[PDB]
Amino acid sequence: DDEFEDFPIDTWANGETIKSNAVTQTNIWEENWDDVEVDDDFTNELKAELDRYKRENQ
Amino acid sequence: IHVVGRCQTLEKSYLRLTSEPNPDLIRPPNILQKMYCLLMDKYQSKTATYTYLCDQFKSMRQDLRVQMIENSFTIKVYQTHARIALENGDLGEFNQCQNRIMALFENPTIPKKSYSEFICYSVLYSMLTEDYPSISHLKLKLIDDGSSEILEDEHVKMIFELSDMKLVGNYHYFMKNYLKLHKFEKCLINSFLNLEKLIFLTIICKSYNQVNLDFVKSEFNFNSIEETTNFLNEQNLTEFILNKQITDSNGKSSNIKILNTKGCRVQLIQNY
Amino acid sequence: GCYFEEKRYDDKLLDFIRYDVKTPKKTKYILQRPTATDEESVRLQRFYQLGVDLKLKYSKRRSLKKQGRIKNATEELLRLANEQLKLFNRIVERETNWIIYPLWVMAKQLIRLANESSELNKDSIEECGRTIHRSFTICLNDRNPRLNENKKIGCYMFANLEFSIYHRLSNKDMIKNLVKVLESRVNARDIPPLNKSLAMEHKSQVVLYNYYLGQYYGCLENDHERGFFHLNEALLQCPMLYVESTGKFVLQGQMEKIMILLVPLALLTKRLYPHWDHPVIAGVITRSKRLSQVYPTLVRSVISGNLSLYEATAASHERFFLSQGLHVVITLLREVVFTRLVQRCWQWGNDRKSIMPLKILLATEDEEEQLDALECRLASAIASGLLRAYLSHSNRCIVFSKKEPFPHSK
């Protein structure tokens, strides 16, 4: 439908790419997949309903 | 101007048309309609070969294509051959018909009789061809067409859900939803059900170390335990059906048939 | 006409080649030294007349003056451009590689020439596709081992033109051919890699080629690991340059529709998720209405094992995911979410004990049926490599490996 094939600028230098600036910039991809705990309503109540299970199954 | 035909003999055999059409051998719709009934008689009473019916239907289909008849009678012929083709394993002529049916449904003058039935066949065939874009492009079409009455039909939902269940290897509900399928839907699934059973069997055998033979039998909808073991014998797994005696509470005992699925692992990874 | 004599090209030539953009009052539009009877010299001279005519048409093209239909006049422009580009192909077939980017600018605007037309019953795209196929071919097979005139360094630029045409109307067979042929060619070293191709001179086509590949791999052939790769590389070669006028990335649109596929492909294959504060993710996610909430919520439900939130996020944007070719990815990524919940009942509900009762997961033949369904969903994950464990139907438990119980590629 809409043309995304027509780029606003046709070329640029390599030094101006994220890959080449990637020693200036840190990793865009966070890699703590095994160890990240997040706290939100769901996680908090998930521990709640599981702490209940450990108490009844002692 | 569309070619018009005046052949009055009801029968006609298929030939790929090389000539410019001969009106004397092309039958008008009223004659194509009188032969539809005779064919239907034969099919219903099972007094004809599927080879014979299929030839008569392709000639009926060919006479409509040269005469540019795209009406409710046309949809009827293609839907009827599609259905009969699935009943006899002729997936090639089914697919010829299925494509034409969907293209004829693009015509607003042609009423959408059994649209949802053939929407289902389209999903089931794309499951067989491992063509998931088609399934998604068709779901998207129904949404953008405003076809919510079709999309919330419980049977249509199940058929789309079945394509997803195969995608993530849910043998438990896929086999449980095999019993909910209509007559020709079962015929279509049967074209790839053996391989799907083998794909499900590998998943079980990679995940357990042993299971009851009855548990395998229940999950795969085998009507009896003899066709359960024939299915394992078809995979060179008969020797992994062992027998272990059981005494759960030291008060009574019996012997059950086990399948060493850990032993099956070495065999089943050779074939894929 | 010294460009063709002494095998160089300037912006004036590119501006002469640019028929869509009108030229200023002073014009130097002329060929030079015309007393030639060689057949191949009249190929150039016919090309010159085709070019002047093409340029003129646009002045009268805007001046329809409410005449009515111009489809015929549009068709005039199209065979004007097509027998012109089929003639440039006759010229470029046996010339040096100086003349390939002029072939490509011509080709790319003939795509936008058929792009404006909105009716595919009378589509003249076939002429273009064939013409460009030859153009891709004329470069694709260069029988000169010396690299002064080799046109196989433009091979990838021309593939993006065909990708663009093959995507116009859904054809997943045709895209599939182009990916698979090209793969073989550089593995036999018949053409040079993209990082040492003519695409480095015009890096717009660098990003685009990695997009077309990664999109094909992720959305059409369901090879997610490679789909992630090329899409990620397409984003890693995007320029860190902003428009002065708004301060947003110059390629904001290109970056975002890469991101639509990249983010869920990144979670499925490698379990990577974005740094939201990071300039590149933040510059794109936060400024796009479509991705501003969906994708933070989508990443969150996967990391947390929130099955309902994932299913709601997938139910609410199903049209969006369907139109982006993401259905399998979403459907497979949901089982990662189910695996993370399983991991969370391990960490917090069984004390990292490798033997876990299945009734733990029920707290989140009614019960017998729920457990049968639960074994099967765990069995499929075990068999796919999201869990290294084995099941026991008898004790209705799962037995995690003592090592690497929840593996994932890295």
Numbering used by the authors:
A (entry chain C): 32 to 89
B (entry chain A): 187 to 458
C (entry chain B): 6 to 369, 378 to 423
Copy the relevant paper text.
Functionally associated with TREX and TREX-2, a less well-characterized Thp3–Csn12–Sem1 complex is recruited to the actively transcribed genes functioning in transcription elongation and mRNA splicing. Bioinformatics and structural analyses revealed that both Csn12 and Thp3 belong to PCI family of proteins, which exhibit similar sequence region characterized by a superhelical (HD) domain, followed by a conserved α/β winged helix (WH) domain. The overall structure of Thp3186–470–Csn12–Sem1 complex has an inverted V-shape with Thp3 and Csn12 forming the left and right sides, respectively. The C-terminal WH domains of Thp3 and Csn12 form a continuous surface to bind different forms of nucleic acids with micromolar affinity.
